[PDB]
Structure formats: C-alpha cells, structure tokens
RNA sequence: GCGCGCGCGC
RNA sequence: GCGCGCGCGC
Ligand SMILES: Nc1ncnc2c1ncn2[C@@H]1O[C@H](COP(=O)(O)OP(=O)(O)O)[C@@H](O)[C@H]1O
Ligand SMILES: [Mg+2]
C-alpha cells in the first residue's frame with residue numbers, strides 16, 4: 009500500500025529521471041503504474057538535493073477532497089523520519105495561509121485555494137515554491153484552476169519578473185488529443201498542453217515496457233458487428249399504442265408539440281426519454297395531472313421498445329404486463345383505465361407475437377456464442393456485462409437465468425456470482441474480471457478480453473474513433489520525444505507568447521418565480537456581493553420567500569450558506585437559492601436561473617448572472 | 632450562491 | 642450560443 013515501504017520498480021526509476029534532472033516534465037503512465045510512488049521519489053530527491061543551509065518547498069495539487077486527504081496522509085507518513093513539515097489546505101480548512109505555506113516544506117492544496125490566494129495577493133508569487141506537482145495534469149486547459157495557476161506562472165516567466173520559478177511536474181494516465189481529428193491536430197493539442205505547463209519533457213516508459221506491461225490492464229479488444237431482426241412486429245403494435253396515447257395527451261394539452269426543443273422524436277430511443285423529460289418538466293396544474301399520467305405511460309412504452317430491441321419480446325411484454333398490473337391494483341381512473349384498456353386490446357396480439365419463434369432476437373444468440381466460447385476455453389471466467397438501460401439489466405439477467413445454453417452462468421445485478429450485469433460502476437475494477445462485453449453500450453489477471461457487440465454501425469464507428477484518437481496520441485508523443493529539447497523549448501515559447509497575447513485581450517426590470525410567475529422583485533433593489541453574488545434589499549422581499557434552515561451548512565469564502573430559500577406561495581414552494589451570513593448580515597442570495605426577467609412585458613430566461621447586463625449596484629453597509 | 636470540467640442533443 | 646444531464650471545487 010501507499011503507507012508502507014516500497015522498492016521502486018525499474019520503470020519508476022525510469023520515469024523519475026527527467027524530473028530529477030530539473031526538467032519541467034509531464035509524466036504519463038497508465039492508471040495503476042504507481043504515480044503516487046514516482047511523485048514520492050521525485051519529491052524526495054527534490055528536497056534532498058538542496059545543499060545544507062538551503063531548503064526546498066513543494067506544493068502538490070489534488071483536484072478533489074478525497075484525493076487531497078489520501079496524499080496528505082501518504083506524504084506525511086513518507087516524510088516522517090526526514091523531518092519535513094507537511095500540511096494541507098482545503099475548503100474545509102478555509103487560517104494564515106501565507107504563514108501556513110511559509111512554515112511548511114510540503115503543502116497539499118486543492119488548487120482553487122491557491123488561485124484565491126494569488127488573486128487576492130495573499131500569496132504574492134509562485135516563487136516561494138521550488139517544486140509544483142499537478143495530479144491529473146491534463147486538466148491544465150480551458151479556465152481550469154490548474155490553468156489559472158499556470159497563467160500566473162507564465163505571466164512571470166514571460167514578463168522577466170525574476171524571481172526563480174518552481175520546477176513544474178505533471179502526472180496523468182492520458183495526455184489526451186482534445187477535439188483532434190488528425191495527427192497534426194493531435195500533435196498540436198499535446199504541444200499546447202506542454203506549453204500550458206511549461207513542460208519540455210514528456211516521460212513515458214520505454215526501457216522497461218515489458219516490466220510495465222506485466223501489470224497494466226490491456227485486454228485484446230474485439231469488434232463484433234451483427235445484424236438486427238428482419239422485422240420488429242412487436243414495435244409496430246407498441247408504436248401505434250404510443251401514437252394513440254400522444255393523441256389523448258394533445259387533447260388535454262393542445263400544442264403539446266411545442267413544449268420541447270427536441271424535434272422529430274422517434275419511439276424507443278434515448279431522445280424520446282429526453283423529450284418526455286423536456287415535457288414532464290414544463291407546463292406553467294390539474295391538467296399536468298392528466299399529462300404526467302400520459303407521459304409516464306409513453307415512458308413505459310419507450311422503455312419496452314428498448315427492451316425489445318436488445319433483449320427478447322417476452323422481456324419487453326413482461327415489463328408492460330408487470331406495469332399494467334400495478335396500475336389496476338393501485339386503483340382505476342377513467343384515464344388510467346383507458347390506457348390500460350387500450351393496452352388490453354392488443355394484449356392477446358402481443359402475447360402471441362412475443363412467443364412466435366421467428367420473432368426471437370438474433371443478437372442474443374451472438375451474445376450466447378461469445379459467452380459459450382470463452383467459458384469453454386477458460387471455464388473459470390468471471391464476466392462483466394454492460395448494458396444500455398436499467399430495464400435491460402433485468403432483461404438480460406432474466407434471459408441468462410432462463411436459458412438452457414448458459415446454465416454454467418450465475419448472474420448478479422449491481423448499483424458467489426460468475427457474471428455481472430450493469431449500466432455503470434465503482435467499485436468495480438474491470439481489470440479484475442477476465443471478460444468484458446459491451447452489449448450495445450456507448451462506452452470504452454492476464455489473458456483478459458473485451459468484446460463490443462452491436463448491430464449499430466454508429467456504435468462501431470465511435471469505438472474506431474476512440475481507438476484512433478488513442479493511437480494519434482501515442483504516435484504524437486513518440487514523435488515529440490524525438491525532438492532535440494532546445495527545438496521543443498523554442499516551439500513551446502511561442503505557443504506560450506501567442507496564448508498570452510490573447511489573455512491580455514440601466515432601466516428597471518421585474519424578476520418573477522419561474523414556476524408560478526409571481527412578482528418577486530425589481531432590479532434597482534438588487535445589490536452585488538464581492539462581484540459574483542446577488543442579494544435583494546428591503547423588507548418587502550422578506551415576505552415573498554420562505555426558507556428551510558439547512559442543518560448541514562458550508563463555510564465558503566465570502567460568507568456561510570446556512571439556509572435554503574423557497575418560494576412563499578404555498579401552491580409553489582420553488583427553489584430560489586440561499587440565505588447567508590455575510591459580515592453580521594442576514595441576507596438572501598439568489599440564482600437568476602430561478603427567475604424570469606421582464607423589460608413590452610417580454611419574458612427572458614437567463615442561466616448565468618454573467619449574461620444579464622443590468623445595472624449592477626454593489627453593497628453599501630448603511631442604507 | 633458562484634466557479635470548473637465532462638457527456639449527450641439542436 | 643441553446644437544451645438536458647453528470648461529476649467536482651470554493
Ligand atoms: N514499486 C512498487 N512496489 C510495490 N507496490 C507498488 C509499487 N508501485 C505501485 N505499487 C502498488 O500499485 C498501486 C497503484 O496505486 P497508485 O500509485 O496511486 O496508482 P496510479 O498510478 O493509478 O496513481 C499502489 O497503491 C501500490 O499498492
Ligand atoms: Mg495518481
């Protein structure tokens with residue numbers, strides 16, 4: 009483990025070396041190579057290299073609290089006995105941050121803290137650090153805190169404000185190629201990433217690949233394009249029942265066709281789900297009793313279509329049978345009883361169609377073949393099966409557990425047993441199964457295999473693209489590691505210079521409750537807090553919201569979130585944002601996303617306050 | 632509250 | 642830019 013002595017593997021000594029030579033280096037190695045151990049050695053070498061009377065200072069960035077706590081503990085245990093001072097700062101920690109940094113040798117930060125401390129000038133300069141280590145360093149792009157930090161660095165390095173600058177090291181399992189759709193674009197993307205981190209070296213394992221390849225998941229991948237049914241006669245009944253039920257809806261809500269942005273919805277697809285969502289979440293109520301009821305049936309049909317597509321009709325029908333038993337046993341409406349009657353007409357035709365052997369799903373025999381072959385070769389195979397939807401998980405399970413040909417299988421659903429069906433995972437650990445099947449899923453011990461099983465050309469094309477994107481990546485790195493370093497440094501510098509040139513480049517309005525459209529406040533009543541937070545003055549506003557005190561509060565920078573504020577109109581109770589304590593003031597704080605803006609009385613819906621270009625008046629203590 | 636990143640769809 | 646969501650930070 010990470011808390012115990014380790015002999016470094018040969019390839020770890022191999023990856024540590026550029027860093028140990030003082031080079032700004034991106035260390036790129038697959039998950040589970042031991043990136044914590046490499047960074048431990050690098051850090052160890054960095055602080056020991058200093059002559060007596062001199063002292064390094066290391067900062068290590070973690071992007072998340074759990075990772076932050078893991079390394080704070082690993083680094084502490086590891087540098088016991090050297091006598092180094094070791095602490096961390098995170099949101100939970102909040103403190104003389106300048107002095108915490110000054111009086112410690114190893115600091116673990118989430119990076120936003122350092123961004124906050126640079127901007128405010130509490131930490132005047134990155135020059136206090138002699139080494140900076142970025143975990144998951146591929147995040148150094150695009151406004152990520154890691155980039156903000158590096159913009160500070162680069163502004164110094166390029167403004168000749170000197171000031172020695174810390175060595176910079178990054179760790180990642182994959183440098184990425186971004187949007188790249190060719191080698192040149194891939195080379196460009198990776199070069200841009202090295203520019204952003206001032207990296208002149210990319211370290212990969214070369215001399216010890218066989219030693220590495222002895223402990224990194226790399227299954228032989230397999231594309232298996234298959235053919236669908238010749239004719240889903242089950243879909244043709246369900247689709248009519250679906251057309252029939254949209255009709256009934258369009259009765260009780262005319263112009264249904266307009267509520268969503270999602271256009272040309274097709275039955276039995278992911279979109280149709282999204283359309284149902286972008287409609288169950290609209291209206292704006294005794295009519296959305298009838299509507300939610302109609303859309304919740306169009307959902308059960310949509311689901312069933314998907315089960316039929318990748319599993320057997322029986323599996324889809326059963327999910328429809330089980331559903332219509334629950335509705336009748338719950339109680340009968342004249343709308344819940346109609347749909348159910350509507351269904352009951354076709355029931356005899358569906359049950360007939362379901363059991364017709366020529367209606368069987370050919371993709372399932374293909375799944376069976378795969379599972380057979382392997383379990384013949386390696387009978388001790390433990391498998392993991394990823395499927396498209398939650399209903400499919402149960403469908404496939406049911407199908408395995410009822411199939412004479414797969415009796416050697418013992419299935420389990422997740423989030424002993426010999427094959428595992430699911431939609432996602434953690435933990436998990438795919439490398440700990442010898443067989444992974446992706447059964448029509450948009451995704452990604454030695455002798456392990458991965459199979460991709462689909463009748464969709466699209467789905468095969470996604471994996472081909474992902475794979476090519478990975479090849480372009482490694483090819484690009486191999487090319488770049490051949491450059492003389494001075495030539496690379498010179499390419500990097502001008503990417504950095506260009507980047508930096510770019511960085512260097514009132515009437516009153518109503519705010520209404522999005523749900524019930526009640527007048528909430530006017531804009532000349534709004535005040536800004538710091539620059540990013542919106543509060544509404546006056547006592548009149550206090551009556552127009554209620555609040556529910558959040559028993560678990562969070563201490564943020566500007567203030568403390570103590571309560572959630574909900575709409576005051578009882579038939580609504582809409583989420584409006586929060587109520588805070590800000591410098592002895594009990595003030596409310598609102599998200600514009602909760603509200604509707606009005607000028608001829610024209611409604612406009614904003615997501616981010618940064619869009620609304622109204623007159624922003626800042627807070628005044630006394631008013 | 633705000634900020635950051637990802638994925639899908641127009 | 643718009644829609645839906647998912648993860649995470651202060
Ligand atoms: N030289 C080594 N000696 C013994 N165990 C190691 C060595 N290198 C890595 N490991 C093991 O492999 C695991 C991989 O963890 P970590 O180093 O965090 O992987 P990652 O490369 O994904 O960061 C470590 O927790 C450790 O238990
Ligand atoms: Mg790591």
Ligand SMILES: [Zn+2]
Pocket residue numbers: 521523524525526575576577580581582
């Ligand atoms: Zn309301």
